[PDB]
Design a protein around this nucleic acid. Structure first.
Ligand code: MG
Ligand code: MG
Ligand code: MG
Ligand code: MG
Ligand code: MG
Ligand code: MG
Ligand code: MG
Ligand code: ZN
Lengths: 138, 59, 208
RNA sequence: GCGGGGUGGAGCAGUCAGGUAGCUCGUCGGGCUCAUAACCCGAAGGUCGUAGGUUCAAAUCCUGCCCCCGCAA
RNA sequence: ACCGCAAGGUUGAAACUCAAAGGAAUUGACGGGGACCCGCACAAGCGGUGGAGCAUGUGGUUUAAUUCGAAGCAACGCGAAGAACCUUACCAAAUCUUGACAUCCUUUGACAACUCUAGAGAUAGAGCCUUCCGGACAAAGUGACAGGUGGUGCAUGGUUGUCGUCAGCUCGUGUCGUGAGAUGUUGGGUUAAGUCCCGCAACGAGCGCAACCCUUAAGCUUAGUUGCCAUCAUUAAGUUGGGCACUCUAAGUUGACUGCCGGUGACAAACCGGAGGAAGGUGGGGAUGACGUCAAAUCAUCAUGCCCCUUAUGAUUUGGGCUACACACGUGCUACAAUGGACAAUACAAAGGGCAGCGAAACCGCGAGGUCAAGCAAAUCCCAUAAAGUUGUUCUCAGUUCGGAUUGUAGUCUGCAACUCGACUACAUGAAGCUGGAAUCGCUAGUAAUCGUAGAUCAGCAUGCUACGGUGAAUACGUUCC
RNA sequence: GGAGGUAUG
């Protein structure tokens, strides 16, 4: 695929195509751009910088596979599934960060993740917690 | 009670709204195409036999 | 496994519509005309070994063309029988019709003629097995690349049904080049209704 | 006549000491299944035999009555 | 009877009952047996159903009838691509009995249309004067006869579904085996494929796979109207003067074949990668469904054997019913809202239909729609403004300006007439519902998801069916499990 | 590459 017009990044477009509902790329585009505007408003610095820091935080490094009773055995996450899960959890836990507008939701989610807080980081550490707990089965 | 009703639809009727189409060779009301005045079955029969111009099974 | 009629598969590819006329609107009359002609030829068809009729229409004329292998029985000797046909047929239609008897030699190579024959044999209460055997025998002597035959119903007066078929040669249905001539007929046997299907494939040619 | 009891369909707690009627099996609907059973998810089903009083509150205490079980007679 | 402390051992029948029990091997099927392979089968993902209201179909009960059929996958928005009447097969009432319909004899005859009385209507009854064009229309007596959506789909033909587009099923000759049977059709390797090669008591072939077929994707030849508008002037507007360059249309052609380069590999097939090229590894999507299984479905498309009714199980009209309603199941629609609702302006499609039908404009009506009336049998005109989208403003988290069920009133169109029982509109009201338990479905790309549009049936009625385009993903680690 | 022991119908 390609990078985005305003910022020239692959991840932004890959994230638009995951926020997008029913192929409303422009709606998703609007709300993500306004979120970058609003996270430049609050916590004044570059939207890409804060965003990339956010995904560096929440993007995990381990995973589990459920097999057999049912063991759940750890495994090293692929570097593509890394960004995949990061962006997915970012969007979803934004959507359930529960306030008025999704741009505000997203802004707060990237903000909290940038400061290593937020539901996405919670899921990350849950994942690693259950992984190391199940480390015996590797 | 088919052939009676065949006669019956082939007659005029006390008002035009009562007039209904059925295939002319098989007295079948449903799935009639009023261009051909044929039902779906006899359409297949005849178009397979090659007896209906234009027609060719598609794609 | 519920397979289709190959003539229906091939129409518009290697063989053409037997009806060869246009009408933007009035199929609602003209197709029923075509069928009623197709039915009225019961007269000939009962004995005259007619394979198929093609039909063409114009503003003035109808031009019909009946294929057979015993054409004498439809033209009389000089024309009495065709004129007998024109009278009643044109009375039905109410339009000037000119006909054209046309000959197909080699009558034991034509699907509907084989089917007609085996049906009348089985009404005369012969044996399905010998019938299909000798049909394919004579067809292969006439030099066809493939024949297939099938009869289905209450063979031998049996209490229940069967489907028996024979073949010799190649009958490539899924090939669309192949001009395989299929025909179905029936036989109102004293026990029930035997349904006969027959298939010939007499080498490969295109209409173009 | 004397003595014990009567709580959803069955069997049992709860009555002694009054405080929102509970347990197992069952019943009904839905699931799984080729179908049935098991199993999973839900829901009904109880004026606590009845009629009176006391109490803010009665299965619970008191009264009266109709049955059930033994003994007898 | 004998032995044994005993448990029990040795010896050892019959009555009666069955027509088999049995052994070795062959073919298949099965396996909670094994190896390999594949598939939206899992898995990684996206969105849903089951929760609510509504539409629809089915079961069950009722009813005079709620016609008949389909009932694990493979019945259940299925027959029905159209239940107000007809359709309609069912029920009630009323009616007919060579009959509503066909073939025959004869009287005949050309015919009747169209009025009026009565009837609910079928119907009779008066007319109206219908005219041999021997065939033809029209009746009439006639017995032969018709008629049957009546039974059997386990007597059937034909048509179809499914295992399954899975890749398998067979045969001729030869050989092995007493024989059933085997080989071939197995093995190595590969392939989407019993696809190909190699080997091998097999050699070949056929039905299947594949290609020929259609569509879509690039180009070229011809042609240039109703289609196009670079060149120029013009006009609101490619419209009109002009050009057919471009697009497009549609006939012929080219194109793609592992065809070529390298590497791998038994050097073979084949695989991996590369170039070129619009496209590359059956390009994508269809059409095409082997032998046969399910005594699968259909006797209500039709045809048909046998059976049955025939002054009635046949036939005619009117009215009812197929639309019921304590409940259960399935398929879908609308939503449970801010990625949104309302209002305003503005933009880009495709595939299709159209003659007594498509109905532009103007006008009236808030709106359903109505009057007039242009063009149009099509690349002309109409259907037909596409909607989502974008730009703004507002509403600011509420059972809400969400949702739009239900009911009340008043109206519009169709029709012989919308109570049962059509759709639609305006107003009023404003229910349930804050994303659904156990379970479970679909989908691997222009797909899923979502937004509109069109058409057959059709007077009128679509949340259904079939078809079209617009926006447009997520993921596939991989085969341990179902 | 083959042999031997080591829940219902
Ligand atoms: Mg899954
Ligand atoms: Mg529901
Ligand atoms: Mg029914
Ligand atoms: Mg049945
Ligand atoms: Mg009626
Ligand atoms: Mg093929
Ligand atoms: Mg059956
Ligand atoms: Zn028909």
């Amino acid at each position: 695929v390609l990078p985005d017009p305003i910022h020239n990044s692959k991840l932004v477009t890959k994230l638009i195509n995951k926020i997008m509902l029913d192929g409303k790329r422009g709606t998703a585009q609007r709300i993500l751009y306004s979120a970058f505007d609003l996270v430049e408003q609050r916590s004044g610095r570059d939207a890409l910088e804060v965003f990339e820091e956010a995904i560096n935080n929440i993007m995990p490094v381990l995973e589990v596979k459920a097999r057999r009773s049912n063991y759940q055995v750890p495994v090293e996450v692929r570097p593509e599934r890394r960004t995949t899960l990061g962006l997915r959890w970012l969007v979803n836990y934004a959507r359930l960060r529960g306030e008025k507008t999704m741009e505000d939701r997203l802004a707060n989610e990237i903000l909290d993740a940038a400061n290593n807080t937020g539901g996405a980081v919670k899921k990350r550490e849950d994942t690693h917690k259950m992984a190391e707990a199940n480390k015996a089965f590797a | 009670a088919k052939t009676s009703m065949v006669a019956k639809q082939q007659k005029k009727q006390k008002y035009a709204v009562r007039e209904y189409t059925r295939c002319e060779r098989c007295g079948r009301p449903h799935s009639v195409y009023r261009k051909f005045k044929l039902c779906r079955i006899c359409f297949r029969e005849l178009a397979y036999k090659g007896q209906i111009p234009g027609v060719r099974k598609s794609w | 496994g519920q397979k289709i009629n190959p003539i229906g598969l091939r129409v518009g590819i290697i063989r053409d519509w037997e009806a060869k006329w246009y009408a933007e609107k009035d199929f609602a009359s003209l197709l029923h005309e075509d069928l009623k002609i197709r039915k009225f030829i019961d007269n000939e068809l009962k004995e005259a070994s007619v394979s198929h009729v093609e039909i063409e229409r114009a503003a003035n004329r109808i031009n019909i063309a009946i294929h057979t292998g015993k054409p004498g029985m439809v033209i009389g000797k000089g024309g009495s029988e065709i004129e007998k046909l024109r009278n009643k047929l044109n009375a039905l239609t109410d339009k000037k019709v000119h006909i054209n008897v046309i000959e197909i030699k080699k009558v034991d190579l034509d699907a509907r003629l084989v089917a007609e024959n085996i049906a009348r044999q089985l009404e005369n209460r012969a044996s399905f097995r010998r019938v299909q055997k000798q049909a394919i025998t004579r067809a292969m002597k006439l030099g066809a690349k493939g024949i297939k035959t099938q009869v289905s119903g209450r063979l031998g007066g049996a209490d229940i049904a069967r489907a028996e078929q024979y073949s010799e040669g190649t009958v490539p249905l899924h090939t669309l080049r192949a001009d395989i001539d299929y025909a179905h007929a029936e036989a109102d046997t004293t026990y029930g209704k035997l349904g006969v299907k027959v298939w010939i494939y007499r080498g490969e040619v295109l209409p173009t």
